[PDB]
């Protein structure tokens, strides 16, 4: 029972790791667009600091 629960938590936690890597990708793309709109001048620096947080 303990080896089975360890393997199931290992598979589920590396799936969780993959989904957090994908959310990191989407947040990085959103900060890339906010830094792009900050250079041009549409977005103020408050939206840039919110995307950076």
């Amino acid at each position: 029972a303990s080896v089975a629960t360890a393997y199931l938590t290992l598979k589920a936690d590396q799936a969780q790791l993959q989904l957090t890597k994908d959310t990191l990708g989407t947040y990085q793309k959103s900060f890339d667009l906010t830094q792009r709109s900050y250079d041009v001048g549409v977005a103020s620096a408050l939206d840039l600091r919110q995307a950076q947080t």
Binding site: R36, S37, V40, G41, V42
Partner: protein
């Protein structure tokens, strides 16, 4: 009329100005239009450079 500009009885080219009616209440509409043009060029330029 602020000023008469043509020499009377002289030959006139097509497009030459003749008078100067008071431009007071009309320069204040040109500034009101030019200000909104200077603000709405920025929307078009920012978004044209940013849609890419």
């Amino acid at each position: 009329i602020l000023k008469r500009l043509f020499k009377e009885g002289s030959d006139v080219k097509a497009g030459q100005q003749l008078y100067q009616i008071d431009p007071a209440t009309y320069e204040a509409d040109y500034q009101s239009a030019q200000a909104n043009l200077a603000s709405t060029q920025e929307q078009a330029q920012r978004y044209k450079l940013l849609v890419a």
